[PDB]
Homo-oligomer: A and B are copies of this chain.
Amino acid sequence: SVAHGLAWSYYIGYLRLILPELQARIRTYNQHYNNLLRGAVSQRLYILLPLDCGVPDNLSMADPNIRFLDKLPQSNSIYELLENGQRAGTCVLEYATPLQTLFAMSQYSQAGFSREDRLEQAKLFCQTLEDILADAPESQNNCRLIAYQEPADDSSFSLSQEVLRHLRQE
């Protein structure tokens, strides 16, 4: 049942506060700070929600097709996404950082929290957060959760492709 508190704190202490000014920050960046000869940053906050709760310290180390470009002024980061070796999209991207509690609990023997318990709580965190965001006034076509289970076959999943599928739905 840890997922409920994780989802509510993440929304009420972070997403609720950053989503209202996000569009204005992206528009300011695109007009005044972005380099001339490249794409504009897309408008939504893209949140990576790996169901395995594996949150890396560097997105480029997780996928070489996701490259840091800049900080979004006014901490959020802009990345370029590659496909077939070329630039395919630019967006504000980050992980659902409360998943780190679920990961750490699965590694702490006193929690009595298995990998199966972790997966169940990650799914509940995603479901609860989606329900909150659906009813939230701050979420106005400006946030997208990217929840994913990684197949056993490495070749059948690309993190950059997962973000690109959502970005192309804009």
Bound Cα distance A115, B18 (Å): 26
Within 8 A of B (CB), among A57-107: 98, 100-101, 104-105
- Contact pick for A4, options B1, B108, B136, CB 8 Å: B1
Closest to A113 in B: B8
Asked if B2 and A101 make an inter-chain contact with CB atoms under 8 angstroms apart, the answer reads: no
Number of interface residues of A (CB under 8 A): 23
CB-CB contacts below 8 Å: A1-15 with B = 1-9, 12-13
B5 touches A101 (CB 8 A): yes
Given contacts A110-B135, A135-B110, A136-B110, contact A105 B4 (CB under 8 A): no
The answer for the CA separation of A104 and B1 in the assembled complex, in Å, is: 20
> Is the C-beta of A36 less than 8 angstroms from some C-beta in chain B?
no
Question: CA of A135 to CA of B108 in the docked complex: distance in angstroms?
Answer: 11
Q: Say yes or no: A111-B8 contact (C-beta < 8 A), given A13-B100, A100-B13.
A: yes
Contact between A2 and B8, CB atoms less than 8 A apart: yes
Q: Is A108 a contact of B1 with CB atoms below 8 Å?
A: no
**Closest residue to A136 on the B side, CB-wise?**
B110
CA of A92 to CA of B136 in the docked complex: distance in angstroms? 37
A132: B residues at CB distance < 8 A = 110
Docked Cα-Cα span, A108 to B13, in Å, equals 12
13 A-B pairs with C-beta separation under 8 A: A1-B1, A1-B5, A2-B4, A2-B5, A3-B5, A5-B8, A5-B9, A8-B101, A9-B101, A12-B108, A13-B100, A13-B101, A110-B136
Known: A6-B9, A12-B105, A12-B111. 14 other contacts (CB 8 A): A1-B1, A1-B4, A1-B5, A4-B4, A4-B5, A5-B7, A5-B8, A5-B9, A5-B98, A8-B101, A8-B111, A12-B108, A13-B100, A110-B132
